Enzyme design. Structure first.
Site, mmCIF file in Angstrom:
data_model
loop_
_atom_site.group_PDB
_atom_site.id
_atom_site.type_symbol
_atom_site.label_atom_id
_atom_site.label_comp_id
_atom_site.label_asym_id
_atom_site.label_seq_id
_atom_site.Cartn_x
_atom_site.Cartn_y
_atom_site.Cartn_z
ATOM 1 N N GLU A 48 0.985 -1.102 0.330
ATOM 2 C CA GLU A 48 0.068 0.150 0.276
ATOM 3 C C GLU A 48 1.041 1.124 -0.191
ATOM 4 O O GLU A 48 0.422 1.907 1.011
ATOM 5 C CB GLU A 48 -0.773 -0.246 1.185
ATOM 6 C CG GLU A 48 -2.246 -1.063 0.441
ATOM 7 C CD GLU A 48 -2.935 -0.896 2.044
ATOM 8 O OE1 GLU A 48 -3.549 -0.152 2.442
ATOM 9 O OE2 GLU A 48 -4.103 -1.610 1.815
ATOM 10 N N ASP A 49 1.378 1.336 -1.270
ATOM 11 C CA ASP A 49 2.585 2.476 -1.541
ATOM 12 C C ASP A 49 3.494 2.964 0.196
ATOM 13 O O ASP A 49 3.627 4.155 0.669
ATOM 14 C CB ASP A 49 1.296 4.038 -1.384
ATOM 15 C CG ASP A 49 0.732 3.979 -2.862
ATOM 16 O OD1 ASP A 49 1.434 2.924 -3.398
ATOM 17 O OD2 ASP A 49 0.370 5.239 -3.335
ATOM 18 N N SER A 50 4.309 1.979 0.365
ATOM 19 C CA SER A 50 5.092 2.290 1.789
ATOM 20 C C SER A 50 6.734 1.632 1.145
ATOM 21 O O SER A 50 6.719 0.837 0.537
ATOM 22 C CB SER A 50 4.708 1.314 2.438
ATOM 23 O OG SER A 50 2.682 1.410 2.892
ATOM 24 N N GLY A 76 5.028 7.631 -1.433
ATOM 25 C CA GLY A 76 4.839 6.624 0.178
ATOM 26 C C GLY A 76 5.644 6.836 0.885
ATOM 27 O O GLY A 76 6.842 7.115 1.128
#
Ligand SMILES: [Mg+2]
Ligand SMILES: [Zn+2]
Ligand SMILES: [Zn+2]
Ligand SMILES: [Zn+2]
Ligand SMILES: [Zn+2]
Lengths: 117, 79, 427, 44, 93, 336, 39, 206, 64, 193, 257, 48
Positions: free
Chosen positions: C57-59, C196
């Site tokens: 998730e965009d990390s 992110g």
């Protein structure tokens, strides 16, 4: 800004016992050694040796959270073998291996450094 | 009398009771089943509900205006 | 780097970066906009792969070891200015070290950093409960109105300028420098539209390693690229590797015709890597080769200004506005969040009345007011003599106590000045 | 204490309640001088 | 369907199609405190005092205003104690 | 003017009565924490020390609370205020010698928050009931709200500078309700579509399609490291599907271990032949679609988003409607 | 203190008597001097 | 704001603190005999102790303004009995109903070489008194009746002068700090001696 | 701003190579030639020098 | 109070810290010695001069505070509570705590205790104490302790201790054993390497 | 039911790298020792910069980061320098830290590069390794930097200032004989340096019952220690953590009571 | 605001605040929509 001391990863605290044998009520001959302030350096090394022993039926390490330093290792062993005995034996067996490599490396460098050639 | 209300406890009366019983235990109230290695008022009281033994009676006021008053023991534990 | 006179300029909120680096893959027309003079990020050995999970998730996962050798270290300058005011006919806001000997209101704090003039020197380490500038107004003995910093400034002051303002008064500017190491939460983003925050950081030893020793400093998730189709981030990942091994800035002008994906790849093949960028990595914790060959490479990363420290807000028994008795804000960002109607309505749906009563009344404005029973008007209730009297009804026996929000008592009191007379009848 | 001038850069020591004008040149922008205390950073 | 019928029955309930935008239900059968909920707070109340309209204080939005446990779920039942049951109490405290 | 003061938006009518600025609450960025159960949150230390439950001192806990007050303020496991019986509050920053304070039954200590609490975690564009669900804290070192990936889908967040709010129920009457009517474990099947709101999401689906495929075989070292991560295990290794040539267990077998109790479900994998069902080889499936889960053991078939995700008849929904709430939460965490 | 806690059940709105106001006032028969204080 | 230091795990392990509930009153010498007979009757049937003791208070003049006060008591009358060292906390009295003075107390028996250890540590001897009188006990409650004697000359117990003709009477209970109503029992016992002597909680201040 | 003392990836000291890199480039060596001559071969140990904007060069033009 | 001697025995060769205790304790068991429980000696330090507080498990309630050459106070456990209460006023020092934990073996009126001064979390060294409860007299019971030590300790046997010091008819004391332990602890803390 | 026997084989040595090849050992023993070569070998490096005058264009915490990552010569004194907690020196202090001082005032016209050579040490043995020179900060006319710093001993798990090695490089099974990694297409993958396969064959044939063995290595020292000592000091250190756990296990197995 | 207070009062009559009966039995079936799942009726479609 929540930057904690990065030496705490290995530093034992005043109120912190390093190894706490917690026997499992659910399974007979099963003990949970929960070394605290170590990590996967010692977790993969200890589990590797416990496995070679034929008597050891199950053996593994889980570091429960990456940002909290602890390991949890369980050694369930045949009836005659003891999980505490399995843990005490491996640390010695790895210590022989490490002592052997160390002695062997010294043998090796001298020849090469002085030039076996 | 004529209870017309459902026998089962309602999803929300198992919440206000678990909580109310808990303020009693924490305040030093007598307990009504054995508590072993347990010091947490909700765990001590969620345990009592499992056994149908909490001291409370629930006034379910009906829409018209009459208070039917079922008791913890009669109500069937829904969980 | 904002402009090259950062040292004399003193604007509020200005953040330099320790090591801005020119990008390995450069559009031909960047030079025109002074970008090999003022770059805005560092080329990172990024590796599009799924590792421990903290990268979903965009990390981005990140190397604790590299953010320790300087990767993205930054200073957050914030300037504070106080102006001496001579507005009063006798009231002068002079500059002085307030002293308990002559000023009545010295507040509870450390007034021992302010030197003689009144200004904390450059080089100290301001902290919470420290007073940066001290001014003692003179009343017709000498109330000290002094300046306190807010919370977590904790930044060594870098410069204190003392000079005449345009108004003709005497004013000072203090730039309080603070260092900002990348942590868990800070936004980092590439040049192709993918933004992110970091999810865990891990040290060089416990990270996937190439077979020549090259551990990735950022591990962006594979899932992000598909649905959004940024298949230019992955091409610049390949070209940057080609450019790094051939030692030349690689041009990626929007349309160059000399860069099909295939032509850039064949160059990478000579150097010895998979023609298409993949490299063989090994799990760091176990050492076993990760079966699927991870795609790794160098990609420019820009460190967005937004940081968790600015965003974080927390409150508990916090300062309250006396007029409306509903929470306000003091130091430390103690103004809490708001239970607005939308979230005052999921609570009704869940059916949770007591949380709603607690969040709305107990948490913000808990008041108990003694109310007369025969008439619903409020009642004088002496506490020391323990008497309760409703003057005007002459009752001393029937004064009930009703808990009401303070916000409401004032609606009830205000309505009475207008003469409407709500009776909080309890019966 | 010791203020520092902007143009001629002379450190003109000034007591309180004094005009903040420098001598020789009239640069009226003056910056305070480093603390004589000591602050200790960790290389970290 | 459960959710569908209720919106399509509450709306067509008093017998006339009712606009339910803030303007449509703005006219409503409510206590002054409930009808002081919409911008005419000063005006409706002055009228209320003269006409002496008691607010029945029986609404979820009405009770929350005066900080009283509302008549919602967790709110529609009052609880009373058992005098006989306390005997089993294994008094320990 | 008084008419002006009680006016409209921002007036004592709206700005101060229906919606007010509540205390005992905090807001911060949310970053991923897979190693957290679906009902855990990881409050940053400062926020946890900046908010506090109130624990009535009682004979059972008088022992611990003595240390918390003695150590108050100085360290994270500390108490800040000791409200007393007559209502006074001995704030412990200024009591000169915190060591000597005398606690008594009926007096309540404001212990700083700690693992095990309950908090209502809510996103700001609140809309569905799934917006304000309760989590149990687990205080962690860094300054971020650490959330499990599965609960992100009902919250509707993605961790890119998103910000979420934490409201701490502050009395034992409210903790019971948040615990019993809105804990993420009790809100998986929404009433809007009678479907499970949260399903195994990003990486865990791409992995489940491949752990649970026909060609996967894990050797002994791997099975034990993997099974120590299951919190439902009865501790018995299963019998490896392939035995004599070498002992190699099959992925389906070690996914039939996460599966809870007994459930019967039959569904189609995302890649499904449009003709196989009718012809021969119907029940031997050449391509391993047709997930069949009989008795709690995947007997055949690869798992996709429809089989494991947020749709009616999903393997997660079969569990909620038969086995339960806590068991379903444990199964989700173990699968991840 | 002693006065019992209780729940508001009905709120009744009326213009208040000119006379009741007079009785409730702590101030003695009308504020008079405009200045807040001189001593 | 700030990382409060994290701190360990031991929470339960340790010791509860001992509160001392004290009520103090005075008896003139002429009526001492009546009070002695009366206390013997109400109290448990034990022969009177008739103790004699020397107490020296040590104060620590550190950077903090308040000096730590440790009271060291030696029993001259009872041979072969260890010196006792006690720390008395600030008054915790709050509720009017309790009608008792509450202080934190730690009681530690010490070896004879106590005076030297304290002086080397840095504690300084301040005031010395010699107390002689009778001790009687009822349940947990202990009633001490003693006549404080001033000590003159820098070091010695051979010569003492009376601080007052009257004798202080103190009712003290070293409760474990678990539960309460300890003060209620004390108030009832004090009430009986109230006609003979008014034992009340007198604040140390002035 | 100033060449970072150690490559972010491995940690090789690269800080001591800027004076020669600028210099070896000056003689005529190509960007490929300088990096290889100084000893940097890994792709990370090269990206610090191939791409550094000297900046202390231009903040030293401001009179003290 | 029974005459006691404590010495440190080096592990030697490549024998691990624990391996050597295991062997030395088995050698003690090979004297017909029978285990009689477990003993824990935990000591904390203060940089005030320098304060030491040590407590052998053999003594159930006593806590010993020793001030170097200055007097030792043998006090009840509430002494540790007083120390903690003073703590804000008191100095603390930095992780100088030292503990020796090992089995107790009894061999006919002699109690032998072999333990590893584990510093903090890491063991380093070995302490041996032989006590004689019947021998109230000290300084000339040295012949006994020496003969018994040469029996089991063999090499590295100590040539007395100075706690006996000047020849005197003074009885041995629990304070003297604590002074031996303090010198041994100062040596482990500083032996280094 | 016992210990394996592991052999070593130095294949090249240089002042800055040792390529050993290790044989007959577990995959774990190797990964573990690879991690101890990176984060548990100790080194001595700067950790208490106190700055007295900095007129340099950088701040005074960039003249800290810069001094800290300088590589000082640990030599054999890391053996004789206790950690600050072990030293009980109440923080820093001589014999628990090495003192480093600097003094540059640039009064000549040309920029005066300051460099590691100007960091001076009270202990002759520990002197910045470059003894060309890392550039701490270029300075203009009239500007001065004077600093006092002390270097405490360090592991590497605490920060990368005390990291002895740069690219520790590992590798086993150069041909994917055990097919740990499934080449999507074996043809395009370039051959490993330690390959034994014939050029035509893409990768060697599956040999299923062979656990991994033949771990390669190439420790490349940054410069604080000679590369061999990084190998030996890792191996001693691992033993201590292993030999420390036993003590506690025993001092704890007995008292399970 | 329009569906502000419809509740399933104790006798199951979904009723608004004035106590007016908006829906006699919730949802016409009395089943709350969480435990209900889609099933095939099986008799409507088949041929006689
Ligand atoms: Mg977002
Ligand atoms: Zn009236
Ligand atoms: Zn000038
Ligand atoms: Zn590198
Ligand atoms: Zn030192």
């Amino acid at each position: 800004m929540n930057a904690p001391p990065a030496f705490e990863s290995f530093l034992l605290f005043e109120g912190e016992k390093k190894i706490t044998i917690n026997k499992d009520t659910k399974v007979p001959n099963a003990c949970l050694f929960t070394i605290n302030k170590e990590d996967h350096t010692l977790g993969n090394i200890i589990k590797s040796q416990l496995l070679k022993d034929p008597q050891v039926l199950f053996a593994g390490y889980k570091v429960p959270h990456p940002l909290e330093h602890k390991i949890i290792i369980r050694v369930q062993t045949t009836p005659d073998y003891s999980p505490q005995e399995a843990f005490t034996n491996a640390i010695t067996d790895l210590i022989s291996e490490l002592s052997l490599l160390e002695e062997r490396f010294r043998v090796a460098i001298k020849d090469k450094q002085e030039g076996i050639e | 009398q004529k209870r017309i209300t459902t026998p089962y406890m309602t999803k929300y009366e198992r919440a206000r009771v678990l909580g109310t019983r808990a303020l009693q235990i924490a305040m030093c109230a007598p307990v009504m089943v054995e508590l072993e290695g347990e010091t947490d008022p909700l765990l001590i009281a969620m345990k009592e509900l499992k056994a149908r033994k909490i001291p409370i009676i629930i006034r379910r006021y009906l829409p018209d205006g009459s208070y039917e008053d079922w008791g913890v023991d009669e109500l069937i534990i829904s969980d | 780097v904002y402009i090259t006179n950062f040292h004399v300029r003193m604007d509020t909120l200005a953040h330099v970066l320790y090591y801005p680096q020119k990008p390995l893959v450069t559009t031909r027309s960047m030079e025109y906009l002074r970008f090999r003079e003022l770059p805005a990020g560092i080329n990172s050995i990024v590796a599009i792969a799924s590792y421990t999970g903290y990268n979903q998730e965009d990390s981005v996962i990140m190397n604790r070891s590299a953010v320790d050798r300087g990767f993205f270290r930054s200073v957050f300058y914030r300037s504070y200015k106080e102006q001496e005011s001579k507005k009063g006919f006798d009231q002068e806001e002079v500059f002085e070290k307030p002293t308990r000997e002559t000023c009545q209101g010295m507040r509870h704090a450390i007034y021992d950093k302010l030197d003689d003039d009144g200004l904390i020197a450059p080089g100290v380490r301001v902290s919470g409960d420290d007073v940066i500038i001290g001014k003692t107004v003179t009343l017709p003995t000498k109330r000290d109105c002094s300046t306190f910093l807010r919370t977590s400034e904790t930044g060594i002051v870098d410069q204190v300028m003392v000079t005449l303002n345009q108004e003709g008064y005497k004013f000072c500017k203090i730039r309080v420098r603070s260092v900002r190491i990348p942590q868990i939460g800070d936004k980092f983003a590439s040049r192709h539209g993918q933004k992110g925050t970091c999810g865990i950081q891990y040290r060089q030893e416990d990270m996937p390693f190439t077979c020549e020793g090259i551990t990735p400093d950022i591990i962006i998730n594979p899932h992000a690229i598909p649905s959004r189709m940024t298949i230019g981030h992955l091409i610049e990942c390949l070209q940057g590797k080609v450019s790094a091994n051939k030692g030349e800035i690689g041009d990626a002008t929007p349309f160059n015709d000399a860069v099909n994906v295939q032509k850039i790849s064949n160059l990478l093949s000579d150097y010895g890597y998979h023609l298409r960028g993949n490299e063989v990595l090994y799990n760091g914790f176990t050492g076993r080769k990760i079966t699927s060959q991870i795609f790794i490479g160098p990609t420019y990363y820009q460190r967005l200004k937004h940081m968790v420290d600015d965003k974080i807000h927390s409150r508990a028994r916090g300062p309250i506005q006396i007029l409306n008795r509903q929470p306000m804000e003091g130091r430390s960002r103690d103004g809490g969040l708001r239970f607005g109607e939308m979230e005052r309505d999921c609570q009704i749906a869940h059916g949770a009345a007591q949380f709603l009563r607690e969040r709305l009344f107990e948490a913000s404005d808990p008041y108990q007011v003694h109310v007369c029973n025969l008439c619903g008007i409020m009642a004088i209730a002496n506490t020391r003599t323990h008497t309760y009297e409703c003057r005007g009804c002459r009752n001393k026996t029937q004064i009930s106590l009703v808990r009401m929000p303070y916000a409401c008592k004032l609606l009830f009191q205000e309505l009475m000045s207008m003469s409407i007379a709500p009776r909080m009848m309890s019966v | 204490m010791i203020y520092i001038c902007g143009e001629c850069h002379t450190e003109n020591e000034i007591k309180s309640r004094d005009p903040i004008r420098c001598r020789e040149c009239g640069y009226r922008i003056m910056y305070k001088k480093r603390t004589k205390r000591l602050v200790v950073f960790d290389a970290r | 369907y459960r959710h569908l019928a209720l919106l399509c029955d509450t709306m067509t309930c008093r017998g006339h199609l009712m606009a339910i935008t803030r303007h449509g239900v703005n006219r409503q059968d409510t206590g002054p405190l409930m009808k002081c909920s919409f911008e005419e707070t000063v005006d409706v109340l002055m009228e209320a005092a003269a006409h002496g309209e008691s607010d029945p204080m029986k609404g979820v939005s009405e009770n929350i205003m005066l900080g009283q446990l509302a008549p919602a779920g967790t709110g529609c039942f009052d609880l009373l104690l058992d005098a006989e049951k306390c005997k089993y109490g294994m008094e320990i405290p | 003017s008084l008419k002006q003061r009680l006016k409209g938006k921002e007036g004592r009518v709206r700005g101060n009565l229906m919606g007010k600025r509540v205390d005992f609450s905090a807001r911060t960025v949310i970053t991923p924490d897979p190693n957290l159960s679906i009902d855990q949150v990881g409050v940053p230390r400062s926020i946890a020390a900046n908010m506090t439950f109130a624990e009535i001192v009682t004979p059972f806990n008088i022992d611990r609370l003595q240390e918390l007050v003695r150590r108050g303020n100085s360290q994270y496991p500390g108490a800040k205020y000791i409200i007393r019986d007559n209502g006074d509050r001995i704030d412990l920053r200024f009591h000169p010698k915190p060591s000597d304070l005398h606690l008594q039954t009926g007096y309540k200590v404001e212990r700083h928050m700690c693992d095990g609490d309950i908090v209502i975690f809510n996103r700001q564009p609140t809309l569905h009931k799934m917006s304000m669900m309760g989590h149990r804290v687990r205080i962690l070192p860094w300054s971020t709200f650490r959330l499990n990936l599965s609960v992100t889908t009902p919250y509707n967040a993605d961790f890119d500078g998103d910000e979420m709010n934490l409201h701490l129920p502050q009395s034992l009457e409210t903790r019971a309700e948040i615990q019993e009517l809105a804990m993420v474990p009790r809100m998986i099947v929404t009433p809007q579509s009678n479907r499970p709101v949260m399903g195994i999401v990003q990486d865990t689906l791409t992995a489940v399609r491949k752990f649970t495929k026909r060609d996967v075989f894990l050797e002994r070292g791997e099975v034990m490291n993997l099974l120590m991560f299951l919190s439902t295990w009865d501790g018995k290794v299963p019998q490896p599907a392939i035995l004599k040539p070498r002992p190699l267990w099959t992925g389906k077998q070690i996914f039939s271990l996460i599966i809870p109790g007994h459930i019967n479900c039959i569904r189609t994998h995302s890649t499904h032949p449009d003709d196989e069902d009718s012809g021969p080889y119907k029940h031997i499936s050449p391509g391993d679609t047709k997930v069949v889960v009989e008795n709690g053991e995947l007997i055949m078939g690869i798992l996709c988003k429809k089989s494991l995700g947020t749709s009616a008849g999903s393997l997660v929904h079969i569990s909620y409607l038969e086995m339960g709430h806590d068991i379903t939460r444990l199964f989700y965490s173990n699968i991840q | 203190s002693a006065c019992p806690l209780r729940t508001i059940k009905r709120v009744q709105f009326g213009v208040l008597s000119p006379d009741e106001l007079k009785r409730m006032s702590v101030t003695e028969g009308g504020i008079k001097y405009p200045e807040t204080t001189e001593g | 704001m700030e990382a409060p230091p994290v701190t360990m795990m031991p929470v339960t392990g340790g010791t509860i603190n001992m509160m001392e509930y004290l009520l103090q009153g005075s008896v003139l010498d002429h009526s001492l005999e009546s009070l002695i007979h009366r206390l013997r009757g109400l109290c448990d049937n034990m022969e009177p102790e008739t103790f004699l003791d020397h107490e020296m208070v040590f104060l620590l003049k550190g950077q903090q303004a308040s000096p730590f006060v440790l009271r060291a008591r030696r029993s001259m009358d009872r041979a072969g009995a260890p010196w006792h060292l006690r720390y008395l906390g600030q008054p915790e009295m709050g509720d009017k109903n309790r009608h008792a003075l509450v202080r934190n107390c730690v009681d530690i028996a010490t070896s004879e070489n106590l005076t030297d250890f304290l002086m080397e540590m840095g504690f300084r001897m301040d005031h010395e008194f010699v107390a002689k009188g009778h001790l009687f006990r009822k349940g947990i409650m202990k009633i001490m009746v003693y006549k404080i004697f001033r000590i003159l000359v820098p070091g010695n117990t051979d010569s003492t002068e009376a601080l007052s003709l009257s004798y202080l009477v103190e009712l003290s209970v070293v409760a474990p700090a678990g539960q309460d109503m300890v003060s209620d029992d004390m108030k009832n016992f004090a009430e009986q001696l109230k006609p003979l002597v008014h034992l009340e909680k007198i604040d140390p201040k002035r | 701003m100033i060449i970072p003392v150690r490559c972010f990836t491995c940690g090789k000291i690269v800080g001591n190579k800027w004076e020669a890199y600028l210099g070896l480039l000056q003689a005529e060596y190509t960007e490929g030639d300088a990096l290889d001559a100084l000893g940097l071969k890994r792709y990370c140990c090269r990206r610090m020098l191939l791409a550094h904007v000297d900046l202390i060069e231009k903040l030293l033009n401001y009179a003290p | 109070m029974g005459v006691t001697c404590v010495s440190q025995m080096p592990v030697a060769e490549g024998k691990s810290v624990q391996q050597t205790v295991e062997l030395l304790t088995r050698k003690l068991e090979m004297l017909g010695a029978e285990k009689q429980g477990t003993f824990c000696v935990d000591c904390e330090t203060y940089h005030t001069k320098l304060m030491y507080v040590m407590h052998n498990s053999e003594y159930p309630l006593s806590c010993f505070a020793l001030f170097e050459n200055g007097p030792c106070l043998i006090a009840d456990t509430n002494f540790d509570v007083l120390m903690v209460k003073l703590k804000g006023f008191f100095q603390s020092a930095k992780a100088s705590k030292i503990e020796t934990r090992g089995t107790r073996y009894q061999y006919c009126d002699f109690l032998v205790k072999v333990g590893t001064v584990t510093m903090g979390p890491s063991a380093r060294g070995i302490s041996v104490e032989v006590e004689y409860g019947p021998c109230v007299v000290a300084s000339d019971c040295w012949s006994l302790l020496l003969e018994f030590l040469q029996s089991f300790l063999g090499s590295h046997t100590p040539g007395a201790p100075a706690v006996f010091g000047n020849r005197h008819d003074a009885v041995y004391g629990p304070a003297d054993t604590m002074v031996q332990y303090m010198e041994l602890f100062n040596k482990i803390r500083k032996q280094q390497q | 039911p016992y210990a394996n026997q592991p052999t070593v084989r130095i294949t090249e040595l240089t002042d800055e790298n040792v390529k050993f090849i290790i044989e007959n050992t577990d995959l774990a023993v190797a990964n573990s020792i690879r991690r101890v070569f990176i984060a548990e070998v100790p080194i001595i490096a700067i950790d208490w910069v106190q700055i007295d005058a900095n007129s340099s264009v950088l701040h005074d915490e960039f003249i800290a980061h810069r001094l800290g990552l300088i590589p000082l010569t640990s030599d054999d004194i890391v053996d004789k320098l206790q950690y600050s907690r072990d030293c009980t020196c109440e923080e820093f202090c001589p014999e628990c830290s090495v003192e480093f001082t600097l003094d540059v005032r640039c009064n000549e016209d040309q920029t005066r590069h300051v460099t590691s050579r100007d960091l001076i040490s009270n202990s002759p043995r520990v002197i910045p390794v470059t003894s060309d020179d890392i550039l701490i900060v270029k300075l203009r006319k009239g500007q001065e930097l004077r600093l006092r710093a002390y270097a405490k001993k360090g592991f590497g798990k605490e920060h990368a200032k005390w990291n002895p090695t740069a690219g520790v490089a590992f590798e086993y099974d150069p041909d994917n004989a055990l097919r740990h990694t499934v080449y999507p297409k074996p043809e395009e993958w370039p051959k490993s340096e330690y390959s034994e396969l014939d050029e035509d064959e893409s990768q060697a044939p599956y040999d299923p019952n062979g656990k991994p063995e033949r771990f390669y290595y190439n420790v490349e020292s940054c410069g604080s220690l000679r590369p061999e000592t990084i190998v030996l000091s890792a191996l001693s250190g691992l033993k201590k953590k292993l030999s420390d756990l036993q003590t506690q296990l025993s001092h704890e197995i007995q008292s399970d009571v | 605001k329009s569906m502000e207070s419809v509740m399933v009062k104790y006798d199951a009559t979904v009723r608004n605040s004035i106590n007016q009966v908006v829906q006699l039995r919730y949802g016409e079936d009395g089943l709350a929509g969480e435990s209900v799942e889609f099933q095939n009726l099986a008799t409507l479609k088949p041929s006689n």
